[PDB]
Structure formats: structure tokens, C-alpha cells
Scaffold this motif. Sequence first.
Motif, PDB file in Angstrom:
ATOM      1  N   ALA A 107       8.926   0.183 -16.433  1.00  0.00           N
ATOM      2  CA  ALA A 107       8.894  -1.025 -15.620  1.00  0.00           C
ATOM      3  C   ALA A 107      10.099  -1.860 -16.013  1.00  0.00           C
ATOM      4  CB  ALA A 107       7.621  -1.794 -15.894  1.00  0.00           C
ATOM      5  N   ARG A 108      10.533  -2.761 -15.137  1.00  0.00           N
ATOM      6  CA  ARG A 108      11.672  -3.602 -15.475  1.00  0.00           C
ATOM      7  C   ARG A 108      11.225  -4.823 -16.260  1.00  0.00           C
ATOM      8  NH1 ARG A 108      13.183  -5.125 -10.846  1.00  0.00           N
ATOM      9  NH2 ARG A 108      13.405  -3.668  -9.088  1.00  0.00           N
ATOM     10  N   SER A 147      10.288  -7.641 -13.767  1.00  0.00           N
ATOM     11  CA  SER A 147       9.528  -6.948 -12.714  1.00  0.00           C
ATOM     12  C   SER A 147       8.137  -7.501 -12.348  1.00  0.00           C
ATOM     13  CB  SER A 147       9.434  -5.453 -13.059  1.00  0.00           C
ATOM     14  OG  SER A 147       9.416  -4.638 -11.902  1.00  0.00           O
ATOM     15  N   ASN A 148       7.620  -7.011 -11.222  1.00  0.00           N
ATOM     16  CA  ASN A 148       6.320  -7.400 -10.651  1.00  0.00           C
ATOM     17  C   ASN A 148       5.223  -6.376 -10.960  1.00  0.00           C
ATOM     18  OD1 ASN A 148       4.507  -6.417  -8.334  1.00  0.00           O
ATOM     19  ND2 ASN A 148       4.883  -8.509  -7.596  1.00  0.00           N
ATOM     20  N   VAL A 149       5.614  -5.120 -10.793  1.00  0.00           N
ATOM     21  CA  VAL A 149       4.778  -3.952 -10.979  1.00  0.00           C
ATOM     22  C   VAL A 149       3.836  -3.929 -12.174  1.00  0.00           C
ATOM     23  CG1 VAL A 149       6.517  -2.638  -9.776  1.00  0.00           C
ATOM     24  CG2 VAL A 149       6.571  -2.734 -12.272  1.00  0.00           C
ATOM     25  N   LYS A 161       4.400   0.254  -3.920  1.00  0.00           N
ATOM     26  CA  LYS A 161       5.617  -0.010  -4.673  1.00  0.00           C
ATOM     27  C   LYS A 161       6.631   1.084  -4.421  1.00  0.00           C
ATOM     28  CE  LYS A 161       4.617  -3.624  -5.823  1.00  0.00           C
ATOM     29  NZ  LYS A 161       5.858  -3.615  -4.967  1.00  0.00           N
ATOM     30  N   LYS A 162       7.914   0.748  -4.508  1.00  0.00           N
ATOM     31  CA  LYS A 162       8.967   1.745  -4.341  1.00  0.00           C
ATOM     32  C   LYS A 162       8.998   2.482  -5.680  1.00  0.00           C
ATOM     33  CE  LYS A 162      11.676  -1.491  -1.478  1.00  0.00           C
ATOM     34  NZ  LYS A 162      12.677  -2.568  -1.667  1.00  0.00           N
ATOM     35  N   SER A 163       8.839   3.803  -5.665  1.00  0.00           N
ATOM     36  CA  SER A 163       8.822   4.578  -6.906  1.00  0.00           C
ATOM     37  C   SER A 163      10.033   5.463  -7.189  1.00  0.00           C
ATOM     38  CB  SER A 163       7.572   5.435  -6.951  1.00  0.00           C
ATOM     39  OG  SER A 163       7.470   6.181  -5.757  1.00  0.00           O
ATOM     40  N   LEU A 191      15.469   3.066 -10.618  1.00  0.00           N
ATOM     41  CA  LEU A 191      14.723   1.864 -10.956  1.00  0.00           C
ATOM     42  C   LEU A 191      15.665   0.672 -10.965  1.00  0.00           C
ATOM     43  CD1 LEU A 191      12.525   1.498 -14.154  1.00  0.00           C
ATOM     44  CD2 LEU A 191      12.411   0.183 -12.085  1.00  0.00           C
ATOM     45  N   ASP A 228      10.956  -0.023  -8.039  1.00  0.00           N
ATOM     46  CA  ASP A 228      10.227  -1.047  -8.760  1.00  0.00           C
ATOM     47  C   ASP A 228       9.631  -0.420 -10.023  1.00  0.00           C
ATOM     48  OD1 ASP A 228      10.853  -2.552  -6.494  1.00  0.00           O
ATOM     49  OD2 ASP A 228       8.821  -2.481  -5.673  1.00  0.00           O
TER      50      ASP A 228
END
Length: 686
Positions: A437-438, A441-443, A451-453, A531, A536
Motif C-alpha cells: 500500500a502507499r 494511500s486510501n486502500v 480499487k485499481k490493482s 502502484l 492503488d
Amino acid sequence: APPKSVIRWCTISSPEEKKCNNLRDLTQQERISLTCVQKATYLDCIKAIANNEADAISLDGGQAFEAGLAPYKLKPIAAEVYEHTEGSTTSYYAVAVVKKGTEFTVNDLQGKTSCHTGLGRSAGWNIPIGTLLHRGAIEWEGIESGSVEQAVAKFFSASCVPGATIEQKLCRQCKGDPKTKCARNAPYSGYSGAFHCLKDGKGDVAFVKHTTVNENAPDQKDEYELLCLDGSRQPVDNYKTCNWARVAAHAVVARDDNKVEDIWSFLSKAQSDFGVDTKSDFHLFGPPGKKDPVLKDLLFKDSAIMLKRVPSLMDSQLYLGFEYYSAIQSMRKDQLTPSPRENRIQWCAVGKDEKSKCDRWSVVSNGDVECTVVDETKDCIIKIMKGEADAVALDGGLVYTAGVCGLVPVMAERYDDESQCSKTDERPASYFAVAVARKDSNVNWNNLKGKKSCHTAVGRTAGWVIPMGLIHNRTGTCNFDEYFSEGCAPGSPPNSRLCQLCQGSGGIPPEKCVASSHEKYFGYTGALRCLVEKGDVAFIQHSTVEENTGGKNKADWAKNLQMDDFELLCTDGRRANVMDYRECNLAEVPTHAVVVRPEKANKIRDLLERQEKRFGVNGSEKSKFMMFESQNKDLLFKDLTKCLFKVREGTTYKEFLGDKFYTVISSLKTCNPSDILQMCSFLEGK
Ligand SMILES: *[C@@H]1O[C@H](CO)[C@@H](O[C@H]2O[C@H](CO)[C@@H](O)[C@H](O)[C@H]2NC(C)=O)[C@H](O)[C@H]1NC(C)=O
């Protein structure tokens, strides 16, 4: 024009033929129909159905072989089942039992006496006879140096057998009268008279139908005990692990074509309506009762409970078991033209890049290591288990299926260095799967949907198998290309939602969503880039970040990047700190493995041990070749391999994988089964 046919059943005698027509009426009032025939023999009935001259006929394992043999190559459509205890019976185990206190196993049995029930009958002749022939015990290549009768003499010194058209050294310890002995009809055989052999000590080795030492006398036990083919020996009820063969149970064959399932439907229906439960004038399985030997097990075996279905793929070589097959292969089906005695190891090559890789070896291995190449990497699993192939080095998931089929890991890889190999201190190696995850980030695992994977490829354990695995246990169905708004997963469909993130081609042909060199978002770092630029979230290794971060990956993007921008995403929401691969990983992913068969194990490891240093990393002849290297690409053996040690003896794939691994890998492929995986599986519940 849709489903609606007629199923022409094959017969043997008139009395069985008569019972055939006696169903006609119903086949008629019903959708699928019939047309009964009659053939003086079953070979005729087999050549008949074969040449489309007929549909199908239910057979036994002794025949199901012949039925599966060329040019006939007929398929087993459905077996029969029975009432015992163990489970839902679909076979009849072929064992062997001797008295306690035995100073041998089998590797030195070229002299002791024996005792059978008769010639050419399973458990008695055929089986142990064939098993011994294929285990080289009896130096034999063809009847003209040692017939199935002759060879006995130059193997035995005694055998109680009703076969006397030629040889005598197989007619000794039979009890009775001096002129009623070597007769199939002598009560000194069957399953009890020959069991009387070890009982009245008249014969040393004796193998009969299992669990007879229960029908006969449950009391007096350990005076006798079963003997395994793998050194070991065990008690009375210790056959489900110490029996010579997986002796099948009457099946139903047929050619291989379009006109198939109707054969399944015109019977399953001829069961649910007019079966054992039928309130008519017919008992399709023969009610447990006595009769005239002329009319025994007619149309279908009389001692049956119901009929179970058999997989599309399922062939003779498979249905009846390896044991039985190996055993009877030792016979005159062919001495050694299409089936030699090449005791040496060989390998399931999977690719022209791999075969020749194996070939690159075959010169510098002077037979010590052979080759047989393949197309689908899944060919490997069947070939080895078919005896055709010997070993294989595959990924995590393939190990699962394999183990279900009966094959297992014997010598796994090592991704750190031999400087941690030949020892038993710290066995497995740490490679983890993380949900990258960033930072800002939101995820998260709880709002991961839509989510964009970023996956590496449509299949790598960490980069795919696991995500989808966990995902499965919260997906409805395996609509993996129906979860994330989109993403890239090089290898997924052309104009799919799963390739949407794929920045494809570097320029020239628009190779988008390719699991090829030609892709930009290919591999771990590729998917990581993903990513960074689009996604995301990205599914990659524990230390996938470190590899680039720190000023390591000196690219147009990574240059700057600090892992102080990436975070681990734990399955419980917890946004774990990158450096805690242990306390926030998706899965502890194993290294590859040489999955093989339960009979060539400890000695196959040897073969790899011989060639290990001979063509290994810190190996000597490094100036000739190697093993892991191959044009600098993972060929059978990944290139990031140093050790390949002999693992722990007596383990299991379930053990080799780990619950948190097996659990999810098992229940993922549940969501979408498959042939091989289906066949091996129905054989598990025999
Ligand atoms: C997802 O995997 C399984 C299958 O859906 C879930 O439950 C099973 O997990 C293992 C089998 O795969 C077994 O060990 C469990 O006993 C079984 N559950 C039951 C009730 O028998 C499992 O819960 C899921 N994985 C996780 C980590 O929750």
C-alpha cells in the motif's frame, strides 16, 4: 439438433442378453433409448463398440486394461460402488501377508518358497508376479529365457500353483492328494487354502485378497502380518498403506467421442428411477443373493450398491491404479520395445527451451539423467505418475494438485546460498507475500474492492495466486476479473479489465497485458512501478521495496523513492510498517520443489545428489555446464538456486505448504476445479 440419442449396450451371453431387452420398454418410455446386442466374447464386444459398431459395456480391471489398449483405447466412463465400512467403496485392495518375525523384505526373496490360489488371477499371480518383474527381482526380458512359468524356477524354488501346462518349480507346497494337487479346484487355495499356506506353514510367501484375515479369524492376529513393498511391514488392518495394488472395481468403458455423456445419462437415469430403490420389476445392481454360475454378475456386477462417475480424462493407465498397471505391464503386453528397463533418472522437460536444456545435459550425464519434453506444464504431473516421467521442479500451486494426485516434494530449492544447505538447523526460507500500500494511500483489506490493482502476472504465487486465494474466501465466485476497478496482470485476457493498467509495449507492436519481456509492468518491480504510477495497491514480495528503494533502482522513477512512502496492508486493516514483513504478510511462500513418486524417493534425491555437485553451483565441472542456468532464464529450475538439498524424510505436501497455505490454495481452486485436479481427487475417495 440438441441431445436425444439411443445407447446400444454390449453383451456376452443370451441370458444376460435377455435381461437387456427387458429394460427396452423403459428406455423407450424414456428420453434416451437403447439397442442391445450380443458378442460371444468381450474382446469381440470391445472391437465392436470400438469401431463405433456399438456404444459401451461394463468391464472389470483385468479387461478394462485390454479395453483401454490400442487400437481400442477405450475410456472408463463410470465405476461401480459397494457396502463395506472404510468409505464409499470403489475398489478391492491387493495385499500380501506373512508370519511375524521376518528377516527380509523382498530385495533378497530370490529363493524362499511361496503359495498362490491359482495362475493368471490377480492378487495371486499377475500382481505380485508383475510387481516383482518390474522391480527387476526376477531377471526376465522375454519368455525365451524364462517364461512366466519358466522364470519362476529361476526365481523361486517353490510355488503352490494350479498352472502346469509347462513348469514344475511353481507346483510344490500344495496340500491334498498325489493326483488332485496342482488343480485350480483344490481347496488349498482361493483366499483360504493359500492363506492356509502360512497357516499350515506350507509355503513362505503368500499374498491374497486383503482383509481375508478378518473374514477367516478376527481373533488370532499377529501370528500373521502384512508386508509392504517399501521395506516396511505392518498388522492385520494395515493394508490401506501396505497393499500391493489399488485393485479397481468394475467400470464402464466406451470409445472417446461426442456420443459420450448420453451413456452417462441413459444409465444414471436407469439408476435414479430403476435402480436398487426402484419399485418395479428390476434390480439394476443384482440384489445380494446366490444364483446359477451361468447367470452371475450379469449386465452389471450383482454385488454392487450403485455406480459412481469417472472423469473425462481418466484412462486405463490411471483408473486401475499404477500398481496394477505396473504389475501387468511387466507381462506380454510388450516385453521391452515401448517399455524398457531404463532404471536411470530422466526429467519432465517443459519447453523446447527446457527439453534441449535437459538435452544439454543428456550428453554430459551419459544416461545418469534422461529426458521427455512437454507442452502444458501440467503434462508433468500425469507423466511421472504414469511412470513415463520421473521428476519435476514446479511452483507452489502445482505442488498442491500433485500431492492430491499422490506425488510429493523430495528435494526443494534454496534461494540464499549453499552456505546454509547441508544441515538441519534452520530448514525453510523466508520469502513473504505482501499487500504493498502507499504511504498516504486510501486502500486497505476492508475497502480493497473497486480499487485499481497491480499484480506481477496472472499466476505467480506472491504476485497472484495468494491475493486471489485470500480474495476467494470473500468473493462469491472466482470472478477475479470483476473485483478491482481495473489493473494490470500480464497474462490476463486481451481487452480485459485486468489488463487495463498495463502500459504494454515499450514502443513498437502494442503488446499490452503481456507476461513477456516486451511488457513494462512485468515482474515484481514492474507491478510496483504500477502502484507508483497508477494503481492503488501492488501484490509483491516482502523485500520487493528494498530492492529499489534506498537509491538502489536507479531508474526514471525509482531514483528518488524511499520505502518511507510504502506501507504493508494487513488482512485485518492494520496498515503495517514495511519493515514488518513477518507481522503483516499475505502468505509465507515456499520455494520450488522436485515433486515425485512415493517409490523412487530417497534414491531420486541421490541421483540429484550425484549430479548436484557434478553440475551444481559450487560444482566442479562449471566449465562444462550447470543446472540452474539456462540462457539466463528459469528453465524447470529457477536460476536463483544454490542449494537443492535432500529435504526431511516422511513429510507431506500439506506439511510442505503450511495450513495457512494449503487452506487457501485448496479453497481457491475449489472455486474452479479441473481435469487432473478432478481425476486425482475422485481417486482419493475410492
Ligand atoms: C479460507 O479458506 C478456507 C476455505 O474457505 C476457510 O475455512 C477452511 O480453512 C481450511 C480449509 O481450507 C480448514 O483448516 C478450516 O477448518 C476450514 N473451515 C472449516 C469450518 O472447516 C478459511 O476460514 C479461510 N481462510 C482463512 C485464513 O480464514
